[PDB]
Every structure is written in C-alpha cells, then in structure tokens.
Homo-oligomer: A and B are copies of this chain.
Amino acid sequence: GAMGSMERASLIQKAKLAEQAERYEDMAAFMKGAVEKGEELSCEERNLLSVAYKNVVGGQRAAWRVLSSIEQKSNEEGSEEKGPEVREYREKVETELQGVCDTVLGLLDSHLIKEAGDAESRVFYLKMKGDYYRYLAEVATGDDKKRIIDSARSAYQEAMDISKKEMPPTNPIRLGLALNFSVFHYEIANSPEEAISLAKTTFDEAMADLHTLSEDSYKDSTLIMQLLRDNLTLWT
C-alpha cells in the first residue's frame, strides 16, 4: 500500500490536516493506511475513518443520483435518442462508488470487526457495515440485489442487538444506528411502517433517559434525536 512507509501517527496527523482542508479523498487514503497498520482504532480514530469515507461516498452518491435522473428522463417516451454516453458515465460513477464501498467493507472484514470487543467499537463498525451495504443497495439492480439488502439488514440487526444490551438509549452511536436502520427500512426494504415504528420508539426511549445526562451529553444526544423527528415529519 502507498502509505506503508508512513508512520501511523503521521497518517493520523495528516488525516486531521486533510479534514481541515476539506480534502476528503486524501483523508480517506490516510485513514486506510492507518487501519492497515493492523492496530485497533481509538474512538477519535474511528470517527476520522467514518468522516473521511462518508464525505467521499456522499459526493459519489449525489453525483450518481444526478446522472440516474438524467438517464431515466432519457428513457421516457418522446425523449430524443442521445447514444450510450449517459448510461456509460452513470456506470463509471457507479463503479467508482461500488469500489469505495468495497474498500470500506474490506477494511471492516480485514480485520476491524473481528478485533472489536467493546460495545462502542463493535456497534460502530457494524453500523458502518450496514451503511456501506446500504449504499451498494441504492445502486443495485441485478440478481444479487436481494443478497446485498440482506447483508445490510444483517449487519444493522447485529449492531442493534448489541446496542440494546450494552448501551443506554441516549448513546449517540446507538441513536445514529437506529436512525440509519430506520432509513434502511424506509428507502431500501420497502418497509415504511417499520421505519416509522423504529424512529418513534428510539426517540421516546431516548427522551426518557435524558435526565441522566450532563449538559454536554444532552447536547450530543438531542442533536441526533432531532434527526429522528425530522425523518418522522417527512414520513408522516
């Protein structure tokens, strides 16, 4: 790997510089290099990894949606034929997106998840696994679409099971996991009622636990609870 000769601490330092410069591709390559040193990641380091790839794949997803919408309009009745270029370029962006997802899933499988024993790391990585299978599902149209969807579901479900057993209902990782799993139900699994039920139950159980928290933990938790409410407002 191209980062094999750089110190782990230097890679982390440069990931933070790249974040400040909004160079998220660089940030992701630095954090990939840090993961490949083989040591477990601290809480801060896990969040550098997720921030980096979330921004990279977020840009790809946005571009893919623009191109997919152009492609769908080109296949309506009355639209002039323009040749293969729209499909080709959508496929190019799609393949790059799938490559980023495969890279992240590869890091989780070799060997972040199998060494993660604490709930905060294990739930974080399983949420990530669910998320990046979800992004693969967003563009899947072939004979493996059902298996990709079930891979996302399975990862989210294991993360949910651990988070219910080991974390308080206000834990921001638990809350963000439930948020994203509810979106999986609504957008991927064609299960809007499950999406709404999960969002509502998650919000209500967090509300009842806010009294245990410091001011700063209260701020962290309520920020994600607001996203649950924002989704419920969109969906109901």
A positions within 8 Å CB-CB of B: 10, 13-14, 17-18, 20-23, 26, 59, 62-63, 66-67, 70, 82-83, 85-86, 88-89, 92-93
Contacts and interface: CB of A to CB of B under 8 A. Distances in A.
Contact of A21 (B22, B26, B66): B66
A62 B23 CA distance: 10
Contact of A10 (B14, B17, B83): B83
B22 A86 contact: no
26 contacts: A10-B83, A10-B85, A13-B82, A13-B83, A13-B85, A14-B85, A14-B89, A17-B67, A17-B85, A17-B86, A17-B89, A18-B89, A20-B66, A20-B67, A20-B70, A21-B62, A21-B63, A21-B67, A21-B93, A22-B59, A22-B62, A22-B63, A22-B66, A23-B93, A26-B89, A26-B92
A62 B59 CA distance: 18
A10 B59 CA distance: 24
Contacts of A93: 21, 23
Contacts of A89: 14, 17-18, 26
Contacts of A14: 85, 88-89
A13 to B, nearest CB: 5
A41 B70 CA distance: 26
Interface SS of A by simple majority:
helix
Contacts of A70: 17, 20
Contacts of A17: 67, 70, 85-86, 89
A23 B63 contact: yes
Contacts of A23: 63, 93
Nearest to A10: B85
Contacts of A59: 22
Nearest to A15: B89
A59 B59 CA distance: 15
A18 to B, nearest CB: 7
A88 B5 CA distance: 14
A17 B88 CA distance: 11
Nearest to A92: B26
